Design a protein around this ligand. Structure first.
Ligand SMILES: Cc1ccc(C(=O)CC(C)(C)CC(=O)O)cc1Br
Length: 133
């Protein structure tokens, strides 16, 4: 029942500062423009200890399955090859991605009826708000 309140199908409804976050990550112009249009469906499910987060989008579909605290390989939507570790900290899913000596942290939280995604690269934060689909 660890991630019960995250499970479901969610649709992106708002984004703030995503272009700057993507710049800080190293995403190039064309990918930033096309990625920034997308309104993905995020599908979260749990089976035993395995959490799956899928993103269905007009830009790029992605899928990760993981066990909390156990590092895994991830190919991000912008085609970075990262090493990811996801933990639960006070009810927040905390996702750290490492690649090329860089790091970004993505936090996912339930707030009211929304799922709020905060993406941080150095001093730059983007906030992406999802509602139930
Ligand atoms: C270029 C690009 C396109 C999409 C995404 C994501 O959707 C994942 C995050 C950042 C975690 C945001 C979210 O899930 O809404 C990331 C990058 Br970089």
């Amino acid at each position: 029942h660890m991630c019960d309140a995250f499970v479901g199908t969610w649709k992106l409804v708002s984004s703030e500062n995503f272009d700057d976050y993507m710049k800080e990550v190293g995403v190039g112009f064309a990918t930033r423009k096309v990625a920034g249009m997308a309104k993905p469906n995020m599908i979260i499910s749990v089976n035993g200890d395995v959490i799956t987060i899928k993103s269905e989008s007009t830009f790029k579909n992605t899928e990760i399955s993981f066990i909390l605290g156990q590092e895994f390989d991830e190919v991000t939507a912008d085609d970075r090859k990262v090493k990811s570790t996801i933990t639960l900290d006070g009810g927040v899913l905390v996702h750290v991605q490492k690649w090329d000596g860089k790091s970004t942290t993505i936090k996912r939280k339930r707030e009211d009826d929304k799922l709020v995604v905060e993406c941080v690269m150095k001093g730059v934060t983007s906030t992406r708000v999802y509602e139930r689909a």
